[PDB]
Design a protein around this ligand. Structure first.
Ligand SMILES: O=C1C=CC(=O)N1CCN1C(=O)C=CC1=O
Ligand SMILES: [Mg+2]
Lengths: 418, 418
């Protein structure tokens, strides 16, 4: 009946549903193959079935509707779309298409979409009246994203430091400099919790590249939104396919004037995947890094903007430095001046078991006056004149206790003032 | 009478068993052919025969029940299974099949399985009610494996130190960084004894890749469990075949809610074996390592998890560094930020005749609060502050003498408490 309702069902329940018609030996199959077999159970009965996904356009012209639940993995249950269908309605990669599914005919190994009902949460004819993303004019970030929960909890303390260190606004292309063993993945989970709580309206997407399988399920059970990731055992091809799909899908929501926020982890691991995928260009930089390969991740990082016409696109990527790898150092150098916002983590503060390990003296964002107010910026500048003489390690020790007593940042602004 | 009881019988007794019927000149051939000749002796007698094995499905469709007593070598006494026999029961590679074997007929050079009695130590009909491996949801390790023996023996200090430095739980994807001549194999033998003593329930499998034939028989006489190895004289195809057959056999036991532990030695030798077998993809990394070659071993190393439904899969693979080869260093770079826990062996401590030579500063685990108790973790962090300023050689020397005074680790904590 509802394909998207079937995918989110646990595999144990899929066995019982398969046994209802009379299917057998389903327990020794993949999760996707069970859905494909179950979709045939409704095919014989002729009952109407609904399913959606994210369109991926192949080089030949015929595409598929990848599922966001399976992290856009090419499975047998992917809905097929004919090349003629993408011409009647102007569609490209990343378009969210929902409609009825017809059973495959003879010679068809994939289910096909019979009628297009909604495209990007809009009518098919309405979606063709939207201006393309690259034709839009970028504008500076001016809508502040309030990262503070306001409950004064221990986890909210990290957000208060983040707000005080570097303000982040809609469309701001941030970047996090993360040395290894510094609580980087703990910081990202705090951001996703605050974003989905303070601003439920904006679409939140979390993209993890080369992440441990035990880390993917921790993020999926924690982030209130859409979490898509590719484990390290997957090939380098799957690292860029799962990345291009996310940015293409994110662009479409901008064309419909929706605020979209992407949390990336990590840009360094994404770039190395591109270096493997692309053919050698002859001219190779130091450390085995292909200088031509860096263009593709720069396109991914350069897509973040605040569109004047409406909406925005926020990318908060994490950079891995001090990892003991020559290639990881080369990647970070290319994205040095590119990031609109920079946040630095201190390894030494992590060894003090002090969280968040925020290097306040070497973090911040340009054009912060467009985000904050006049009085807010001046109060922050007072702390900038206070923390700067102090060292990095003791600054967080001093800053954490000061922010602990006050529940809110403005309350703290009334503390150090007097 | 029993094929598995025939294999473990020494070849001297097999000659006596062969001479009882009247078989002539059996001494001048391999032990595999002697078993095959003895089996044909009972073929004409007509008495029922018994045996078991581990499946290995070829691309053609048929399989063989290789035996772990011969390190899954393609012996002439491997039981053949029909392509439809793996269809009536939903079978796949790595399934442990036991049952009566019928003698080969005319045109058949291999023994054939006549009746499937037990699959994975379970009824052949209940084996198809188990969910596949990858469909299981991975999770963080939260059940600590008590590596401490507690008897106060001299070799117990090796395990007692390891529990102090890097706690290991069920499903903990570990990684041991071992330079050459640092007592690596002495550490593995100590682990395989404490695990087989403290936790008899978990399936302890030890896999040695590219190891000397001398060390194989040393491990087989010490480890109380399955010890399967491939010597260096074996081709590169045997290293990957003997490694795929081990992870697949471990995956099946996970589906039956059984904890399985794999002690790999070493992930570097395994990766180099895969680099030889797989074809060139056109992109070559530094040091001669193919880019897509490392995808296969990462899947082997990435299968370790603590399945939420039940059971686990613990892989402890050794990494070889400082071997003077650029290929060995490249492999370690890819598996750097991959394992759940790391344990660094130090050459300098080994040259001081200090055992175990463990680099306490650079060794540690992740999410250790899940394994250890609240108060135990506090004591460990107290120890970290003491060790942190000390060097590698002195701290291990300081730790060893302190641990020798007390019988148990917690008793040692009291001595250093005040
Ligand atoms: O074609 C397949 C695939 C598995 C399988 O057993 N067979 C048939 C083999 N087979 C005969 O043709 C007559 C007796 C018998 O066992
Ligand atoms: Mg060591």
């Amino acid at each position: 009946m509802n394909l998207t309702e079937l995918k989110n069902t646990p595999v144990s329940e899929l066995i019982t549903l398969g046994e209802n018609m009379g299917l057998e030996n389903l327990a020794r199959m993949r999760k996707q193959d069970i859905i494909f077999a179950i979709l045939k159970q409704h095919a014989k009965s002729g009952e109407d079935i609904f399913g959606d996904g994210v369109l991926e356009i192949l080089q030949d012209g015929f595409g598929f509707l990848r599922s966001a639940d399976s992290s856009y993995l090419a499975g047998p249950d992917d809905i097929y779309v004919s090349p003629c269908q993408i011409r009647r309605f102007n569609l490209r990669t990343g378009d969210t298409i929902s409609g009825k599914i017809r059973p495959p005919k003879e010679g068809e190994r994939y289910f096909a979409l019979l009628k297009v009902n909604e495209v990007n949460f809009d009518k098919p004819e309405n979606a063709r009246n939207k201006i393309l993303f690259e034709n839009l004019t970028p504008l500076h970030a001016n809508s502040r994203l309030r990262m503070e929960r306001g409950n004064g909890s221990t986890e909210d303390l990290t957000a208060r430091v983040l707000d005080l260190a570097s303000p982040i606004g809609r469309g701001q292309r941030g970047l996090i400099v993360a040395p290894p063993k510094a609580g980087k993945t703990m910081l990202l989970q705090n951001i996703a919790q605050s974003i989905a709580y303070n601003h439920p309206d904006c679409v939140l997407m979390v993209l993890l590249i080369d992440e441990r399988p035990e880390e993917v399920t921790e993020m999926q059970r924690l982030v209130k939104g859409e979490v898509v990731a590719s484990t390290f055992d997957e090939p380098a091809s799957r690292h860029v396919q799962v990345a291009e799909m996310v940015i293409e899908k994110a662009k479409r929501l901008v064309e419909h004037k929706k605020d979209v926020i992407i949390l990336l982890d990590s840009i360094t691991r994404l770039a190395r995947a591109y270096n493997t995928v692309v053919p050698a260009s002859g001219k190779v930089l130091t450390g085995g890094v292909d200088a031509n390969a860096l263009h593709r991740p720069k396109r991914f990082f350069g897509a973040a903007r605040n569109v004047e016409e409406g909406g925005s696109l926020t990318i908060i990527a994490t950079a891995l430095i001090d990892t003991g790898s020559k290639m990881d150092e080369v990647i970070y150098e290319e994205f040095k001046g590119t990031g609109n916002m920079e946040l630095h983590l201190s390894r030494k503060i992590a060894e003090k078991r002090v969280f968040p390990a925020i290097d306040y003296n070497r973090s911040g964002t340009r054009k912060e006056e467009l985000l904050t107010t006049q009085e807010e910026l001046q109060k922050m500048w007072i702390l900038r004149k206070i923390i700067h003489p102090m060292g990095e390690i003791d600054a967080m020790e001093f800053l954490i206790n000061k922010l602990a007593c006050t529940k809110t940042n403005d309350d703290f602004f009334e503390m150090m003032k007097r």
